[model samples]
Target: KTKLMTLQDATGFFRDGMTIMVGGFMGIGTPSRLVEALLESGVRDLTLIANDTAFVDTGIGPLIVNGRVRKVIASHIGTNPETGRRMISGEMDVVLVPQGTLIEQIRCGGAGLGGFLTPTGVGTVVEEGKQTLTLDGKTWLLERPLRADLALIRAHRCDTLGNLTYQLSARNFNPLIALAADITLVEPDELVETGELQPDHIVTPGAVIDHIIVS
Candidate 1:
């Protein structure tokens, strides 16, 4: 059965210093309710992985702005001044990855693969401190797979069985992140009976979802 829960109950799974993957591009696809609940839970020292750190009050940026995060592995922090501030101030560790590389790393994690080779960062700063391979007279960086202790994502609709359907661009990162985490949590804008959703329309399957909190 799909475990229906309150925001508090969902936050109960979180703890300090945990590595978490949050699905969002800016704030479009983020789960706002759970983010608020996470803040109220007072869990600190988080390691967040996402595409970007959004605005000060949007997406997971509030956690960094409030000094709740100790580290962040994201594609960019340009939009979130607080993220950059904390990172350069030495209060938070930031590892910036290319967007394409970052998503593939998470995808590898979800697929149970060891790692993948990419030439995106061959000559730049990304090559340092990492193993490299020369194949066909070209060099590639070995970017390791990225997994998380928990994943939080949003959905447009969900059935009682936990299958999810994301709305438009809200689908970004949610599916891959859902599978890469040890446990995944979701909140759907609308909930319906199992049979109501079209079989092929489901994005994140119910099997991968560990918990649900209604929006």
Candidate 2:
């Protein structure tokens, strides 16, 4: 079956209060068209999981600035001042995880593991309210898996079957999030017929993706 979908058709899957994982690092790997479509869809109370919300005018920034997002789980939000303001003013909830810990949580979510322990935040506020264990006299915080209702991903190229390949830097967080979401939607910069993409060149296999959007 063909996975191609129009932007309007794709928006049909979204709803209020959906948990969405977006692949990006400061807008580099994020799906801009889908993000804009989601913004126009008027979905509310969305929980966005990503490395960071890019600048206020790019990536997931517009969503945060427009109040479409209710919460964000990311490693950083420093680039988007609006995100910080909203978080501080209580207009939104922001959970800042250590970068390494955040990706591991996503990986664990994709692998279906219970959770993992790391010493990254042993002595800081990151440990608050989370369970911890002592190993070799060092405390490790138990970071839980992070899954999402949908994953919005961007790729440099995709085949009809949804196999994806990403450009440099844009590959960050995309392949991992593709595995962790219940539904993975990709916006490919270029779409090609099946078999056009070399087997080894594919970063994300077609089996994990649910839809492809070109516009």
Candidate 3:
């Protein structure tokens, strides 16, 4: 049986001004269709959390280009030229975290670790306003783990029951962010029966996934 819903239904799960966690690095396996649907829905003031800002005409890039994003918490964003320009021009709010620290934050968030200490951004701008702790004579910055209201994820394949797997590099942050959101929306290239997939290959179990929109 097909568990189908309209793009409106998918978009309806998101609200304006809410924080969103989006999976995918650059354009590979990014949720372009879902982002398109989001754009069509006209939602605004989004605080988007992603690995990086995609290039123009690619994943999450269009939304940033269209000026729908208010704040971004990402590891790197140099790929999206406009994002940097907007940040420097004071038209955008960006919170830059080290790539490893960013991934660890998401990982910690998923694991229920509220905050963690890292030396990645020490002695840099990222340490501002954060607590400093010293461990073994080394200074580390306290980075609060972030959880979003909704998470948009892209997967290579999923079962009807919501067991998921991601393609090669497209899996960036998708599995970790799955458990770190109240509502998770997934778009997968393929959908199959529950038992058809190998148990070990299921990157995300059904317990953490709320909805699956098969593309």
Candidate 4:
């Protein structure tokens, strides 16, 4: 069966209090139209997982700026001053994580692992309130898996069956986020026949995608 869907139809899947994973690095690989659609849908109290929130006027920034998001789990929020302000003022809850650790947590979620241990923040504030274990005289912090109710991702091209391919740096978090959500929604720049995409070029197979939005 086809996975192609309208933006409105896909937006309907989102609801208040949902945990959403968005693919992008400062808007480069973000699904722009889907973001707009979600904004229009007026969902609130969302928990967002991403590399960064992008700038105030771009990517997932709008969601943050509009106060639709109640919390954010990401590696950085330096670019968006509003996010920092909100976090400091207690308007929103922000969880900062090491970039590598964050991605690994998502991978573990997709792979169905309980969690993993890393020494990235062994002696810092990041280690507070988390379990620590010593192995071979080295201390490691346990980071839990990160999963989402839905994922919003972008791709350069997609087949009718939902297989996806991304371009250059835009491929960054798109592929990883696809695997870490209950329902993965893709917004592709170009959509073609099911057999048009070569197997080798497909970065994300159709099996992981729940829907596709072409713009």
Best by lDDT: 2
| Clash counts for all predictions | 0, 0, 0, 0
What's the CA error at residue 21 for candidate 4, in Å? 0.1
Tens-place lDDT digits, model 3, residues 1-215: 44455566898876789898888888786777788998888888999998888897887888899999999998888888999998999878998888888888888878899888888888988888889999999999987778889988888888887889988998878898998888888888888888988998888997788888855
Better of 1 and 3 by TM-score: 1
Q: What C-alpha RMSD separates each model from the true structure?
A: 1.0, 1.0, 1.6, 0.9
| Candidate with better TM-score, 3 vs 4 | 4
Worst 10 residues of 1 by lDDT: 1-10
TM-score of each: 0.97, 0.97, 0.94, 0.97
List clashing residue pairs in candidate 2: none
Candidate 3: global Cα-lDDT? Answer: 0.85
Q: Considering lDDT, which of the candidate structures 1 and 4 is the better prediction for this target?
A: 4
Model 2, C-alpha of 70: deviation from truth (Å): 1.1
Reference-based TM-score, model 1: 0.97
lDDT, candidate 1, at 97: 94
lDDT of 3 at 30: 79
